[PDB]
PDB file of C-alpha atoms and ligand atoms in Angstrom:
ATOM      1  CA  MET A   1     104.809  98.909  35.679  1.00 22.85           C
ATOM      2  CA  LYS A   2     103.915  99.879  39.161  1.00 25.89           C
ATOM      3  CA  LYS A   3      99.678  99.509  38.888  1.00 26.00           C
ATOM      4  CA  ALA A   4      98.928 103.119  39.921  1.00 28.08           C
ATOM      5  CA  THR A   5      95.568 105.294  39.715  1.00 25.78           C
ATOM      6  CA  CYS A   6      94.559 106.614  37.187  1.00 24.69           C
ATOM      7  CA  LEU A   7      95.203 110.437  35.367  1.00 25.08           C
ATOM      8  CA  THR A   8      92.164 112.339  37.223  1.00 26.89           C
ATOM      9  CA  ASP A   9      89.538 111.553  40.162  1.00 28.27           C
ATOM     10  CA  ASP A  10      86.931 111.488  37.150  1.00 30.15           C
ATOM     11  CA  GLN A  11      88.702 108.825  35.204  1.00 32.00           C
ATOM     12  CA  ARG A  12      88.873 106.554  38.301  1.00 33.82           C
ATOM     13  CA  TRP A  13      85.800 106.971  39.339  1.00 33.57           C
ATOM     14  CA  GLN A  14      84.829 105.542  35.926  1.00 31.78           C
ATOM     15  CA  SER A  15      86.221 101.999  36.843  1.00 32.28           C
ATOM     16  CA  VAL A  16      84.590 101.890  39.569  1.00 31.28           C
ATOM     17  CA  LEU A  17      80.716 103.061  38.881  1.00 30.76           C
ATOM     18  CA  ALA A  18      82.294 100.894  35.681  1.00 31.15           C
ATOM     19  CA  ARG A  19      82.472  97.736  38.025  1.00 29.66           C
ATOM     20  CA  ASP A  20      85.070  96.325  35.666  1.00 30.86           C
ATOM     21  CA  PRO A  21      86.186  93.012  37.488  1.00 29.70           C
ATOM     22  CA  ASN A  22      89.006  92.953  35.101  1.00 28.69           C
ATOM     23  CA  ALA A  23      90.172  95.917  37.152  1.00 31.01           C
ATOM     24  CA  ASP A  24      93.569  94.240  38.338  1.00 31.40           C
ATOM     25  CA  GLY A  25      95.991  96.971  39.162  1.00 32.28           C
ATOM     26  CA  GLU A  26      93.089 100.012  38.984  1.00 32.79           C
ATOM     27  CA  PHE A  27      92.618 101.550  42.107  1.00 32.49           C
ATOM     28  CA  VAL A  28      91.664 100.471  46.107  1.00 33.64           C
ATOM     29  CA  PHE A  29      88.997 102.294  47.078  1.00 34.58           C
ATOM     30  CA  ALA A  30      89.659 103.321  50.728  1.00 33.58           C
ATOM     31  CA  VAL A  31      86.247 104.324  53.121  1.00 32.37           C
ATOM     32  CA  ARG A  32      87.066 106.628  55.749  1.00 33.26           C
ATOM     33  CA  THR A  33      83.934 105.411  57.028  1.00 30.20           C
ATOM     34  CA  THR A  34      83.759 101.717  57.623  1.00 32.33           C
ATOM     35  CA  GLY A  35      88.199 101.984  57.511  1.00 32.48           C
ATOM     36  CA  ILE A  36      88.415  99.877  55.175  1.00 36.56           C
ATOM     37  CA  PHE A  37      89.871  99.732  51.509  1.00 33.59           C
ATOM     38  CA  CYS A  38      88.493  97.842  48.151  1.00 32.80           C
ATOM     39  CA  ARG A  39      90.851  96.299  45.622  1.00 33.38           C
ATOM     40  CA  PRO A  40      91.365  97.235  42.641  1.00 32.23           C
ATOM     41  CA  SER A  41      87.891  96.586  41.156  1.00 32.68           C
ATOM     42  CA  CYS A  42      85.058  96.082  43.269  1.00 35.24           C
ATOM     43  CA  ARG A  43      81.450  97.517  43.037  1.00 35.56           C
ATOM     44  CA  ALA A  44      80.092  97.712  46.530  1.00 34.97           C
ATOM     45  CA  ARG A  45      77.924 101.192  47.244  1.00 34.14           C
ATOM     46  CA  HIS A  46      80.455 102.514  50.279  1.00 35.49           C
ATOM     47  CA  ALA A  47      81.772 106.214  50.308  1.00 33.38           C
ATOM     48  CA  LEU A  48      80.145 108.498  48.304  1.00 33.09           C
ATOM     49  CA  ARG A  49      82.133 111.318  46.159  1.00 30.34           C
ATOM     50  CA  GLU A  50      84.220 112.880  49.050  1.00 32.14           C
ATOM     51  CA  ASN A  51      83.911 110.125  51.743  1.00 28.90           C
ATOM     52  CA  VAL A  52      86.537 108.206  49.554  1.00 28.27           C
ATOM     53  CA  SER A  53      89.969 107.646  49.166  1.00 29.36           C
ATOM     54  CA  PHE A  54      91.831 106.385  46.213  1.00 30.09           C
ATOM     55  CA  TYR A  55      94.848 103.901  46.763  1.00 26.98           C
ATOM     56  CA  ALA A  56      97.468 102.757  43.531  1.00 24.85           C
ATOM     57  CA  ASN A  57      97.654  99.349  45.171  1.00 23.19           C
ATOM     58  CA  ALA A  58      96.224  97.244  48.010  1.00 21.19           C
ATOM     59  CA  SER A  59      99.644  97.998  50.047  1.00 20.69           C
ATOM     60  CA  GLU A  60      99.102 101.237  49.711  1.00 22.17           C
ATOM     61  CA  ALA A  61      95.624 101.746  51.635  1.00 21.61           C
ATOM     62  CA  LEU A  62      96.752  98.914  54.238  1.00 24.71           C
ATOM     63  CA  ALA A  63      99.570 100.363  55.146  1.00 26.15           C
ATOM     64  CA  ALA A  64      97.708 104.024  55.641  1.00 24.45           C
ATOM     65  CA  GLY A  65      95.662 102.031  57.844  1.00 24.23           C
ATOM     66  CA  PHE A  66      92.881 100.145  56.748  1.00 24.82           C
ATOM     67  CA  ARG A  67      91.611  97.206  56.265  1.00 24.02           C
ATOM     68  CA  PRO A  68      90.785  94.975  53.183  1.00 25.81           C
ATOM     69  CA  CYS A  69      87.505  94.114  51.153  1.00 25.93           C
ATOM     70  CA  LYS A  70      87.438  90.838  49.576  1.00 26.25           C
ATOM     71  CA  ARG A  71      85.115  89.403  47.409  1.00 27.19           C
ATOM     72  CA  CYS A  72      85.519  92.526  44.473  1.00 25.59           C
ATOM     73  CA  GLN A  73      88.374  89.846  42.418  1.00 27.07           C
ATOM     74  CA  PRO A  74      91.569  91.031  43.987  1.00 26.17           C
ATOM     75  CA  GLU A  75      94.216  88.703  41.676  1.00 25.09           C
ATOM     76  CA  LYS A  76      93.038  85.738  40.079  1.00 24.96           C
ATOM     77  CA  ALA A  77      89.640  84.204  40.652  1.00 22.43           C
ATOM     78  CA  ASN A  78      87.097  84.621  37.737  1.00 21.79           C
ATOM     79  CA  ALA A  79      87.928  82.097  34.675  1.00 21.21           C
ATOM     80  CA  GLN A  80      85.734  84.243  32.256  1.00 23.32           C
ATOM     81  CA  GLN A  81      82.173  84.094  33.533  1.00 25.04           C
ATOM     82  CA  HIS A  82      80.190  84.286  30.198  1.00 26.21           C
ATOM     83  CA  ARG A  83      76.973  82.826  29.380  1.00 25.22           C
ATOM     84  CA  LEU A  84      77.532  84.581  25.481  1.00 25.29           C
ATOM     85  CA  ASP A  85      81.423  83.700  25.775  1.00 26.84           C
ATOM     86  CA  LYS A  86      80.854  80.184  26.759  1.00 26.53           C
ATOM     87  CA  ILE A  87      78.604  79.376  24.069  1.00 29.94           C
ATOM     88  CA  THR A  88      80.425  81.001  21.490  1.00 26.37           C
ATOM     89  CA  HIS A  89      83.065  78.551  22.497  1.00 24.28           C
ATOM     90  CA  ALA A  90      81.738  75.566  22.171  1.00 24.97           C
ATOM     91  CA  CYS A  91      79.996  76.632  18.708  1.00 29.73           C
ATOM     92  CA  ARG A  92      83.575  76.416  17.170  1.00 30.67           C
ATOM     93  CA  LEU A  93      84.842  73.745  19.583  1.00 29.91           C
ATOM     94  CA  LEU A  94      82.042  71.516  17.914  1.00 29.03           C
ATOM     95  CA  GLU A  95      82.675  72.394  14.611  1.00 29.03           C
ATOM     96  CA  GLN A  96      83.005  68.875  13.650  1.00 30.47           C
ATOM     97  CA  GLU A  97      80.696  66.251  11.028  1.00 30.44           C
ATOM     98  CA  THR A  98      80.913  63.282  13.172  1.00 29.56           C
ATOM     99  CA  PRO A  99      77.971  62.700  16.515  1.00 30.47           C
ATOM    100  CA  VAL A 100      79.218  64.559  19.671  1.00 31.98           C
ATOM    101  CA  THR A 101      78.706  63.369  23.056  1.00 30.05           C
ATOM    102  CA  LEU A 102      76.341  65.980  24.642  1.00 29.96           C
ATOM    103  CA  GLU A 103      78.045  65.677  28.337  1.00 29.39           C
ATOM    104  CA  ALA A 104      81.314  65.999  27.136  1.00 28.89           C
ATOM    105  CA  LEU A 105      80.652  69.672  26.646  1.00 28.03           C
ATOM    106  CA  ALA A 106      78.522  69.589  29.502  1.00 25.68           C
ATOM    107  CA  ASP A 107      82.254  68.062  31.066  1.00 24.85           C
ATOM    108  CA  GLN A 108      84.438  71.129  29.858  1.00 22.62           C
ATOM    109  CA  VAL A 109      82.204  73.628  30.976  1.00 30.13           C
ATOM    110  CA  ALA A 110      81.243  71.701  33.939  1.00 31.10           C
ATOM    111  CA  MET A 111      77.165  71.872  34.015  1.00 31.09           C
ATOM    112  CA  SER A 112      73.838  69.919  32.819  1.00 35.81           C
ATOM    113  CA  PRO A 113      72.640  69.694  29.622  1.00 38.22           C
ATOM    114  CA  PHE A 114      69.865  71.847  30.445  1.00 39.17           C
ATOM    115  CA  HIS A 115      72.034  74.873  31.037  1.00 37.78           C
ATOM    116  CA  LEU A 116      74.182  74.180  27.663  1.00 40.65           C
ATOM    117  CA  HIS A 117      71.023  73.672  25.681  1.00 40.75           C
ATOM    118  CA  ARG A 118      68.951  76.216  27.381  1.00 38.69           C
ATOM    119  CA  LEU A 119      72.191  78.603  26.758  1.00 40.90           C
ATOM    120  CA  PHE A 120      72.805  77.530  23.699  1.00 41.38           C
ATOM    121  CA  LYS A 121      69.150  78.153  22.312  1.00 41.02           C
ATOM    122  CA  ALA A 122      69.224  81.863  24.016  1.00 42.07           C
ATOM    123  CA  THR A 123      72.375  82.366  21.514  1.00 41.64           C
ATOM    124  CA  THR A 124      72.345  80.200  19.112  1.00 41.08           C
ATOM    125  CA  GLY A 125      68.175  79.415  18.279  1.00 38.94           C
ATOM    126  CA  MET A 126      68.975  76.547  17.209  1.00 37.08           C
ATOM    127  CA  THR A 127      70.197  73.153  18.049  1.00 38.00           C
ATOM    128  CA  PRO A 128      73.286  71.790  17.060  1.00 36.83           C
ATOM    129  CA  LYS A 129      71.480  68.764  14.998  1.00 37.54           C
ATOM    130  CA  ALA A 130      69.506  72.051  13.290  1.00 39.89           C
ATOM    131  CA  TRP A 131      72.990  73.288  11.731  1.00 40.44           C
ATOM    132  CA  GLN A 132      73.758  70.078   9.899  1.00 40.31           C
ATOM    133  CA  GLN A 133      70.696  69.470   8.687  1.00 40.38           C
ATOM    134  CA  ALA A 134      70.559  73.143   7.553  1.00 45.15           C
ATOM    135  CA  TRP A 135      73.085  72.178   5.421  1.00 45.41           C
ATOM    136  CA  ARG A 136      71.402  69.500   3.572  1.00 45.12           C
ATOM    137  CA  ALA A 137      68.050  70.940   3.444  1.00 45.28           C
ATOM    138  CA  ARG A 138      69.641  74.325   2.088  1.00 46.60           C
ATOM    139  CA  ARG A 139      71.721  71.860  -0.542  1.00 44.15           C
ATOM    140  CA  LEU A 140      68.336  70.211  -2.001  1.00 45.02           C
ATOM    141  CA  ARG A 141      66.422  73.330  -1.848  1.00 42.48           C
ATOM    142  CA  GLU A 142      68.515  75.397  -3.443  1.00 43.03           C
ATOM    143  CA  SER A 143      68.077  72.876  -6.878  1.00 44.93           C
ATOM    144  CA  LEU A 144      64.129  74.159  -6.564  1.00 45.62           C
ATOM    145  CA  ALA A 145      63.454  70.858  -4.737  1.00 44.62           C
ATOM    146  CA  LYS A 146      59.985  70.943  -2.165  1.00 44.55           C
TER     147      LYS A 146
HETATM  148 ZN1  LIG B 201      85.800  95.418  47.969  1.00 44.44          ZN
END
């Protein structure tokens, strides 16, 4: 209830230095120099540890007489933003046995086969075709085959 600042200056400065894009409700940084207040999150190098103000909500700092600074995720913007989290979702989504369309997976991610194939290779390391063949090869080799 009521998105307020942290319990101390050090505790709040943490979220600021952390640059957590999911700080929707953290605290807006008021700049006395430029006279602007950044959304709860934000990570733009502005105002040192003395020339910066702390506001619970953008409405609070704005009323005081400051200009709002966007581009720091104010509310509703990034759906996920993550290469590892994306491929992880694909790996689970592609838990079928029948050959699935490549571009189809590209449709959900809204990217080309170069990104998915590259990302999947950067994390997984092996293509989806290798996974299926891996099980078959393991079942055959497990019987002292080859
Ligand atoms: Zn900002």
